[PDB]
Design a protein around this ligand. Structure first.
Ligand SMILES: OC[C@H]1O[C@H](F)[C@H](O)[C@@H](O)[C@@H]1O
Ligand SMILES: [Ca+2]
Length: 769
């Protein structure tokens, strides 16, 4: 490997061999079908709300999130980079597709597939990823850096449906070598959203943009229809000319054929026919190819940028609503703008690289932090793009001031902005994209007094319940299968209108968003204040026994939605205490004296009774009335965790908090698989995992990262990082279960999982507060 010295990969990048088989991989541990796309994954490309494309460590474009809210795992084999090399003096050169695999059927059989093992590496530190190619049959070594401009405090470039592929080629040998790099792409119009005639009318054109000291050559792959539908738009691939490279292209090759129309040209001398052809297709799939060719002398290095863009302006959800995607603000809505997007990337990628380096640098340069922690911190952010992210710029047919936003909990539980989960998972938004965060919270504020008296069947017990109760915060803002932002509470496994955590978590999120953006945004507190008061007042009515604390009802009436709580729970009780203290403080900021006094009174009574009911001398009991009420819960002091972040001080005695955290580390971490897999949710005081429910026997990745954050604030530094390390290890390490770029909600002691691609582990960013 002589190419790594010519590029700048951070030591904390996650790494794997191209074509590496992984032997330890986990699978779903549930009864019903659950997504398992395998361990062949990579860091995604594409902006927030743009739709994303997962290019895996084997080189294939395989995890398709272009249909917003859906996960489709299938390798589009025509989408590749390929290389040609010929040493001066030899009769023939060699050509190779840079993909460690081959097609299942006979399409593209002429191409040279099966990139060999032990001949290259993949690296990822989101939003960047890299491939190096160090192959004994390729004398010139190559590397690519690929990325999308995902940039904190930037709501523009961060939305773009674009990827840059910055190639570096170096000749370590003593002979001249002719080199070509080719990007191929299928015209994917009709890949989704078209019920019949899926290729019909697709056509490709070549754009040559020649301006002094600029040449870009690009293929635009679109459809003859000017219809404005979810399926219609354009894809573009292209390259910017640099000194010493020549550009060639082929506008149209057949993807549903043997591929020799293209490959016979590329494999001969690395130079394509430059054949334009705008003839639309009928049944056949078609694609385009953009190539560069250059000669590298001994010791010479050259850099060349390619790019990919996709202009699919309309997202459609299953309930029938069509919305424009955020990036349309910047490029237009007509779906004929893929070249403009591509051109912007090709002309500005160096600036974008520097902007990404500027934001990563504070963390990467901190030599007190171990590299594994940096690997997790950056790569967990993949989910902000890959979580079915929806970000609207108007309803089709509709002009408002704000752009509504939603992140899925996951794809198996297809619910936007699940608030009980976002309590953990929204840290990167408040810390890095706070205008999005506040918009999402205003969305929730607006739902507080919505009433929908129509009834739904509760999944857990078959009983009927009201969809949405006035003054109760919703579980979610809908489903991609129905009507995001419009029809809330798509979730039906339990009735969220009786949950005891949602209203408190809402208030805690509001105050968090004020505190972590500098305690300056009084207008945000003013906007949300009525909803905060309503939320707490409604929750107070669920106190059955007049101890000043809402009573859990012997059912799963909170985020642990199969784990029953009864009476006063440590979890919901501590959240309530903290929410009361937050509301007191907002009351002071907004000069609402009567609110301050009321929530102060409620807080004092609740705090006294919480401590009396639950403090056992070593930790806080799980709750007051359940069968295993003395279980040690990993999340028992979630309210105190948030109180630390919100700078609300002690809600419980410092000494008791420290004892409880040490107990959790000693039991839930260290007695669960020797502390190498995170914190199990429930442990009995005899040191055996609590078996009352599956959720008690699970490690929750986002809960564990949050607990690590809590330990860190409380000065338990070793315990914090050891606790978090288990999650990193399981996710990323060779000794783990292969969950990179699909971190699940949960695993059991065998390492098998529930709900890959989950929002909650974004909570790792609470470790950076
Ligand atoms: O894993 C538990 C988790 O499962 C689903 F995502 C639910 O919608 C969430 O409310 C719940 O917290
Ligand atoms: Ca009570």
């Amino acid at each position: 490997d002589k190419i790594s010295h010519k590029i700048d990969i951070p030591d904390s990048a996650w790494t794997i061999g191209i074509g590496e088989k992984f032997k330890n991989a986990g699978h779903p541990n549930v009864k019903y079908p659950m997504i398992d796309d395998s361990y062949v994954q990579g860091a995604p490309l594409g902006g927030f709300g743009a739709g994303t494309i997962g290019r895996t460590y084997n080189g294939g474009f395989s995890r398709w999130h272009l249909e917003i809210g859906k996960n489709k795992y299938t390798t589009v084999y025509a989408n590749q980079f390929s290389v040609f090399q010929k040493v001066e003096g030899n009769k023939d050169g060699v050509a190779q597709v840079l993909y460690a695999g081959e097609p299942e059927n006979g399409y593209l059989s002429s191409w040279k597939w099966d990139y060999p093992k032990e001949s290259g590496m993949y690296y990822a530190l989101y939003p960047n990823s890299w491939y190096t190619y160090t192959n004994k049959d390729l004398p010139v070594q190559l590397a690519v850096k690929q990325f999308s401009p995902i940039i904190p405090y930037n709501y523009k470039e961060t939305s773009y449906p674009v990827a840059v592929f910055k190639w570096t080629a170096y000749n370590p040998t003593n002979k001249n070598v002719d080199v070509s790099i080719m990007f191929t792409w299928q015209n994917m119009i009709g890949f989704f959203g078209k019920q019949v005639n899926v290729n019909s009318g697709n056509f490709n054109k070549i754009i040559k943009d020649k301006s002094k000291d600029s040449e870009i050559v690009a293929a635009v792959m679109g459809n003859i229809s000017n219809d404005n539908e979810e399926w219609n738009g354009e894809y573009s691939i292209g390259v910017k000319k640099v000194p010493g490279v020549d550009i060639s292209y082929k506008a149209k090759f057949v993807t549903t054929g043997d591929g020799s129309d293209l490959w016979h040209e590329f494999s001969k001398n690395g130079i394509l026919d430059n054949k334009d052809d705008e003839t639309p297709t009928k049944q056949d799939g078609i694609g385009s190819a953009i190539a560069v060719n250059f000669k590298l002398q001994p010791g010479q290095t050259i850099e060349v940028p390619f790019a990919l863009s996709w202009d699919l302006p309309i997202m459609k959800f299953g309930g029938g609503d069509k919305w424009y995607k955020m990036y349309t603000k910047y490029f237009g809505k007509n779906g004929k703008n893929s070249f403009a997007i591509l051109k912007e990337a090709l002309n500005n990628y160096q600036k974008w690289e520097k902007m990404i380096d500027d934001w990563q640098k504070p963390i990467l340069s901190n030599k007190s932090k171990p590299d594994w922690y940096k690997t997790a911190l950056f790569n967990e952010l993949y989910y902000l793009a890959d979580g079915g992210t929806a970000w609207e710029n108007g309803k089709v047919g509709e002009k408002r001031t704000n752009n509504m936003f939603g992140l899925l909990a996951c794809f198996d539980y297809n619910y936007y902005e699940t608030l009980d989960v976002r309590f953990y998972g929204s840290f990167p938004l408040v810390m890095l994209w706070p205008d999005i965060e506040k918009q999402v919270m205003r969305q929730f504020a607006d739902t507080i007094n919505v009433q929908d008296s129509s009834e739904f069947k509760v999944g857990s017990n078959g009983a009927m319940a009201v969809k949405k109760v006035q003054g109760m915060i919703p579980h979610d803002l809908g489903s991609s299968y129905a009507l995001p932002w419009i029809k809330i509470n798509a979730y039906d496994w339990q009735n969220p209108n009786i949950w005891k955590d949602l209203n408190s978590k809402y208030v805690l999120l509001v105050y968090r968003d004020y505190v972590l953006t500098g305690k300056t945004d009084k207008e945000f507190l003013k906007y949300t204040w009525k909803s905060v008061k309503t939320a707490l007042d409604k929750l107070k009515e669920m106190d059955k026994d007049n101890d000043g604390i809402p009573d859990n009802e012997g059912i799963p009436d909170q985020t642990y939605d199969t784990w029953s709580m009864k009476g006063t729970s440590a979890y919901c009780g501590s959240l309530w205490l903290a929410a009361l203290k937050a509301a007191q403080e907002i009351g002071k900021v907004l000069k609402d004296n009567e609110a301050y006094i009321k929530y102060n009174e409620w807080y004092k009574i609740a705090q006294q009774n919480f401590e009396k009911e639950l403090w056992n001398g070593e930790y806080y009991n799980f709750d007051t009335e359940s069968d295993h009420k003395d279980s040690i819960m990993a999340d028992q002091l979630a309210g105190q965790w948030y109180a630390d972040i919100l700078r609300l001080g002690d809600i419980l005695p410092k000494d008791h908090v420290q004892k409880a955290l040490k107990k959790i580390y000693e039991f839930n971490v260290m007695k669960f698989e020797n502390g190498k897999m995170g914190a199990v949710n429930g442990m009995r005081p005899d040191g055996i995992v609590d078996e009352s429910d599956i959720q008690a026997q699970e490690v929750w990745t986002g809960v564990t990262y949050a607990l690590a954050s809590f330990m860190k604030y409380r000065g338990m530094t070793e315990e914090a990082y050891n606790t978090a390390y288990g999650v990193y290890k399981m996710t990323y390490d060779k000794s783990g279960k292969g969950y990179w770029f699909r971190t699940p909600e949960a695993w059991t002691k065998d390492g098998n999982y529930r709900a890959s691609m989950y929002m909650r582990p974004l909570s790792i960013w609470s470790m950076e507060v």
